[PDB]
DNA sequence: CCGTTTCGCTCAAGTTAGTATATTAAAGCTGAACGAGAAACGTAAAATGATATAAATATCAATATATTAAATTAGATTTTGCATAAAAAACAGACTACATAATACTGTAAAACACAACATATGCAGTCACTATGCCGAC
């Protein structure tokens, strides 16, 4: 399921909703979630999950191909935490 | 085995047996020319799969405790569907006033052609030549 296939299956089910409307809606939601995480704000969707931002202290990296040294500026990285409903439904085991 | 004559067949000219329609009225069929929106294609560009390794970071059970997004109300209020009715403006229903065509009637020049005596070129009336083989006569 890609970004396009996602809009396709959502437009097929929603007949009373223009296909073009669903196409833009999906693109605006993803862009809104990507912009929020950029501003430094978290995301919390009850049932789905919750996006966060974890800090990464600056450390002297090392080229994994050769083994040299490379500086690494301190930055933040997105982190998703599956919700309760998401885990239980995605968990096929016990 | 082969030939000859009768018989099954079809062409050609008489002798009988059978059935009977035209216009309205309104379609119905089908070859051929006419006029846009959406998605499968494709080359090109952007994001991602490829790839590995010691060090860095996330994986998560089991429970106490402060924190918080947010559906669940619950009461407050702009928003929304629907006329009611009068102030205000549009516009037939009247009417005289005003400028304008169809018509009423007088005033005057001149178009359009018969009628009549002449004048005369031109077509018609009457006769011979132009132009070249017939007919008749010989070969």
UniProtKB/Swiss-Prot annotation:
<dbReference type="InterPro" id="IPR005685">
    <property type="entry name" value="IHF_beta"/>
</dbReference>
<dbReference type="GO" id="GO:0006310">
    <property type="term" value="P:DNA recombination"/>
</dbReference>
<comment type="function">
    <text>This protein is one of the two subunits of integration host factor, a specific DNA-binding protein that functions in genetic recombination as well as in transcriptional and translational control.</text>
</comment>
<dbReference type="Pfam" id="PF00216">
    <property type="entry name" value="Bac_DNA_binding"/>
</dbReference>
<dbReference type="InterPro" id="IPR020816">
    <property type="entry name" value="Histone-like_DNA-bd_CS"/>
</dbReference>
<keyword id="KW-0233">DNA recombination</keyword>
<dbReference type="GO" id="GO:0006417">
    <property type="term" value="P:regulation of translation"/>
</dbReference>
<comment type="subunit">
    <text>Heterodimer of an alpha and a beta chain.</text>
</comment>
<dbReference type="InterPro" id="IPR000119">
    <property type="entry name" value="Hist_DNA-bd"/>
</dbReference>
<dbReference type="GO" id="GO:0005829">
    <property type="term" value="C:cytosol"/>
</dbReference>
<keyword id="KW-0238">DNA-binding</keyword>
<keyword id="KW-0804">Transcription</keyword>
<dbReference type="GO" id="GO:0006355">
    <property type="term" value="P:regulation of DNA-templated transcription"/>
</dbReference>
<dbReference type="InterPro" id="IPR010992">
    <property type="entry name" value="IHF-like_DNA-bd_dom_sf"/>
</dbReference>
<dbReference type="GO" id="GO:0003677">
    <property type="term" value="F:DNA binding"/>
</dbReference>
<dbReference type="GO" id="GO:0005694">
    <property type="term" value="C:chromosome"/>
</dbReference>
<dbReference type="GO" id="GO:0030527">
    <property type="term" value="F:structural constituent of chromatin"/>
</dbReference>
<protein>
    <recommendedName>
        <fullName>Integration host factor subunit beta</fullName>
    </recommendedName>
</protein>
<comment type="similarity">
    <text>Belongs to the bacterial histone-like protein family.</text>
</comment>
<keyword id="KW-0805">Transcription regulation</keyword>
<keyword id="KW-0810">Translation regulation</keyword>
């Amino acid at each position: 399921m890609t970004k396009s296939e996602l809009i396709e299956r959502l437009a097929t089910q929603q007949s009373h909703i223009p296909a073009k409307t669903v196409e833009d809606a999906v693109k605006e939601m993803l862009e809104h979630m990507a912009s929020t995480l950029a501003q430094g704000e978290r995301i919390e969707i009850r049932g789905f999950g919750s996006f966060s931002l974890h800090y990464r202290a600056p450390r002297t990296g090392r080229n994994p191909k050769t083994g040299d040294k490379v500086e690494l500026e301190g930055k933040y990285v997105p982190h998703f935490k599956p919700g309760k409903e998401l885990r239980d439904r995605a968990n096929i085991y016990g």
